[PDB]
Design a protein around this nucleic acid. Structure first.
Ligand SMILES: [Mg+2]
Ligand SMILES: [Mg+2]
Ligand SMILES: [Mg+2]
Ligand SMILES: [Mg+2]
Lengths: 117, 45, 54, 114
RNA sequence: CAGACCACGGGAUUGAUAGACCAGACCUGGAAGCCUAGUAAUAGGUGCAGGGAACUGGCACUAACCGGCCGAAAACUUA
RNA sequence: GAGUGAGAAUGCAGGCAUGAGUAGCGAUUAGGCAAGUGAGAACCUUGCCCGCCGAAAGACCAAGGGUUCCUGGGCCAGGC
RNA sequence: GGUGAAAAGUACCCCGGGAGGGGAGUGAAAGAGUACCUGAAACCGUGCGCUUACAAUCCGUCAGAGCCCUCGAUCG
RNA sequence: AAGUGUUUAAGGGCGCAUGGUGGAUGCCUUGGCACUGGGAGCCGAUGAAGGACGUAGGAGGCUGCGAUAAGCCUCGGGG
């Protein structure tokens, strides 16, 4: 959640937050996301903070998760399925890899996944 | 904001540069004959 | 600001030669038994198969 | 010695300078290394060069029996081809001219078994 | 905290370099829930509480990869 | 017998360099993820999210273009 | 404006989606392949021999060692 | 220890071999310009000159033609 320290990812302000929220939603829903390198980098700490909130989730944490995510089914699955799955991992639940760039705009492409072990 | 000074129209076009108006006057008939001699595809509007 | 004179052929080519590209480093990787070259950046993804190999 | 096979590709829709930019990165190298390079390059102009090199290799293999394991890019030209001209409006009515350049790629691959 | 690119500085499994987690300093003001007084807004105990990014110390949990390229001596004269 | 000899008249016609592989790629909204077609996809099709207009950036007509309207096929040429 | 005397316009094989190209064929010629008689100048590439990263040049001329190719008998 | 000493080309310059772009030069035309000897020099309400539309079995143009619509009837040429 550290400030980007420079020009935001999605155009002007008020859009990077929604972009990161949608990316975290897609991640927690599918189990793997393929995005741009900087987008995945900015999502890594966001997704890790959301996973920590889920882990600590007993009460008042569902509210903190819902104030950032809107998909009720996504929140429910992130709270139930994941749940204590990371109760032993003391951080670092998101793995980031770099893949070949796409055509047109040569944007470094990255892929984020949830560690399973 | 100008109208570009074109303002397309069919009725006014035919009324101001039509075959009837070109044949009414003598100079119009002369111009039509000159165009026909030159071989223009469209004599008038 | 406009070009006053015509740049000479040498004055043009000396700098045009700078507009070049840098080839990327490659790394040998064993996938499906066959060995193929993939940059070290995508080396990790090559193992998992997230890098298509035409 | 000096067995060679040529391969051309005319009327390519790539500028001669941008084509030579990628050619310089593979001029004088083995066919295997040439096919390895030009695939991960960021410039979206290496596909025609790779296709021409693959066609040259296939021709040398199916018409001269040369083993593809001992083929090296011996020569490459990448000349400039025709240029279609077009216009482009501008601020104050002036009509600028845009040039749609092309390229004629030419390669010659020989065998140099050390 | 070096920087337009470049370049500079530290690390690369013999590691705290960065991300995450814990704790500290600091900012903000008393979080969601329960119960109580009040028909009512509202206040009170759970509560220096809840929340937080740059500062700091631990923690290899995640990424520095079973990885690639350049890169080292003609010779001769005098003392 | 010459329409007979060009180096210039900010001379005319056709091609190509310099400027430069630089600018610009044409506002006041912003795209993201999954699946699919396709050899080639951020820009094509379906599903889920975020954002804009909502006296319109919605609908119907007048003038104007006339088959751009719908279906099957194509990516040389035109989409900055 | 002009392929070629006649389209006899490359069957067939290979790279690829094509464009286009390489073999195999017609044509005397494909340095005649619907971009086609002859195919110059400016422009752009590649390779070959010398040159230059201490050097202030209307960008030439006269002297001038070295390197490179060649004709004769190591020199002229 | 002092001195002498060829050795590098990120790129450019010079001459040559190979080539692309380019369509001039050389050779020709179904075309164009100026004149010689003749024909005939007006066409029309019994609808002129020129145009829109349609016409071959087929998507468009040139030309002929006009719902009898690349054609209808008679008379001579050639095959
Ligand atoms: Mg003259
Ligand atoms: Mg001249
Ligand atoms: Mg500049
Ligand atoms: Mg297209």
């Amino acid at each position: 959640p550290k400030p980007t320290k420079g020009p935001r990812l999605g155009g002007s302000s008020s859009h990077q937050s929604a972009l990161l929220a949608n990316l975290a939603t897609s991640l927690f829903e599918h189990g793997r996301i393929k995005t741009t390198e900087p987008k995945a980098r900015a999502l890594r700490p966001y997704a890790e903070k959301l996973i920590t909130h889920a882990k600590k989730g007993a009460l008042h944490n569902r509210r903190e998760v819902m104030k950032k995510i809107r998909d009720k089914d996504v929140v429910h699955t992130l709270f139930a399925e994941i749940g204590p799955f990371y109760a032993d991992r003391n951080g670092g639940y998101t793995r980031i890899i770099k893949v070949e760039n796409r055509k047109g705009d040569n944007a470094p492409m990255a892929v984020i996944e949830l560690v399973r072990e | 904001k100008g109208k570009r000074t074109f303002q397309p129209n069919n009725r006014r076009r035919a009324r101001v540069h039509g075959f009837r108006l070109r044949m009414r006057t003598r100079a119009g008939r002369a111009i039509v004959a000159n165009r026909r001699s030159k071989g223009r595809r469209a004599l008038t509007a | 600001a406009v070009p006053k004179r015509r740049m000479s052929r040498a004055n043009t080519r000396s700098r045009r030669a700078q507009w070049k590209a840098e080839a990327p480093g490659l790394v040998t990787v064993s996938v499906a038994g066959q060995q193929r070259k993939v940059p070290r950046r995508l080396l990790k993804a090559a193992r998992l198969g997230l890098v298509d190999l035409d | 010695e000096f067995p060679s096979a040529t391969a051309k590709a005319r009327y390519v829709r790539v500028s001669a300078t941008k084509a030579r930019r990628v050619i310089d990165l593979v001029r004088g190298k083995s066919v295997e290394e040439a096919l390895d390079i030009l695939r991960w390059a960021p410039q979206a102009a290496s596909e025609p060069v790779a296709k021409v090199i693959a066609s040259a290799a296939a021709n040398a293999q199916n018409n001269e029996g040369l083993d593809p394991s001992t083929l090296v890019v011996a020569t490459v030209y990448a000349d400039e081809g025709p240029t279609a001209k077009r216009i482009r409006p501008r601020a104050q009515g002036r009509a600028f001219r845009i040039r749609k350049r092309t390229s004629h790629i030419t390669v010659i691959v020989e065998s140099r078994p050390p």
